[PDB]
Design a protein around this ligand. Structure first.
Ligand SMILES: NC(=[NH2+])c1ccc2[nH]c(-c3cccc(OC4CCCC4)c3[O-])nc2c1
Lengths: 246, 8
């Protein structure tokens, strides 16, 4: 995240940290994700696309730091990994960039509620906040596009949703952005999501609840002027989500 | 106790 503040998982108790294990002993961070129900985490298909081997990923809930542990964290194995059939990437955008991971702990259980583990709410079929709404994004991604490491403390920042008309302007993303994506930027292009933030949440309040409105997906550079961040418009994937989380 | 989606 460029900008933002450092936070603790109690401020984002539905954020999930997904890692991949390597032969050699290292486990590295892959993407962020959010908990929707006790056994399901939702993230982004491009995060798994080049290595769809579910037994090599680890999902942690209750983690405020990236490589050191937090008291209260839970560790899980990926029991099912559902990627999106019709996922495509072009020079910038990813289409249908949503994925579901079913988690199981080594004792056969799913997540348990704590002050550091909570689910986030889903929107109702195709219902979104209006452009202008301030939503918050969180994650362990880069702090400057030139960094080659990720911060060790969880960050969060506030960004506003912008309109498709504004994002589809030729000097922004033109038609690379579709009705299944949302764009959110900082009025003064100061904070935004960046590499390492993919799969984590865009949370806005809808009808009184904190809802997962978008998934960090892509963007050109990080916090660049007229280069909003693009998120998967979760309200338009509710059918797909249900199909697998029934 | 149980989950209340959205609550901190
Ligand atoms: N400017 C943005 N709003 C933005 C947001 C998320 C991003 N994620 C990435 C990104 C870049 C390179 C590789 C990635 O994922 C691969 C690493 C491991 C799995 C796939 C990214 O998510 N760029 C990103 C840019």
């Amino acid at each position: 995240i460029i900008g933002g503040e450092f936070t603790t998982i109690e401020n984002q108790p539905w954020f999930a940290a997904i890692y991949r294990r390597h032969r050699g002993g290292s486990v590295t961070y892959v993407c962020g994700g959010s908990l929707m129900s006790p056994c399901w985490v939702i993230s982004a298909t491009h995060c798994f696309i080049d290595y769809p081997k579910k037994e090599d990923y680890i999902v942690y809930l209750g983690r405020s730091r990236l490589n050191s542990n937090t008291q209260g964290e839970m560790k899980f194995e990926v029991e099912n990994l559902i990627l999106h059939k019709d996922y495509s990437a072009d020079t910038l955008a990813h289409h249908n960039d949503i994925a579901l991971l079913k988690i199981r702990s080594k004792e056969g259980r799913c997540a348990q509620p704590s002050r550091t583990i909570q689910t986030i709410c889903l929107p109702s079929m195709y219902n979104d906040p209006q452009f202008g709404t301030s939503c918050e994004i969180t994650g362990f991604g880069k702090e400057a596009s030139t960094d080659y490491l990720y911060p060790e403390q969880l960050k969060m920042t506030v960004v506003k949703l912008i309109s498709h008309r504004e994002c589809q302007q030729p000097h922004y993303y033109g038609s690379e952005v579709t009705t299944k994506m949302l764009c959110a930027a900082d009025p003064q292009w100061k904070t935004d999501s960046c590499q390492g933030d993919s799969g984590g949440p865009l949370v806005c309040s809808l009808q009184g609840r904190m809802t997962l409105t978008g998934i960090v997906s892509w963007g050109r550079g990080c916090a660049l002027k007229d280069k909003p961040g693009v998120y998967t418009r979760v309200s338009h994937f509710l059918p797909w989500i249900r199909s697998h989380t029934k | 106790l149980k989950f209340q989606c959205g609550q901190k």
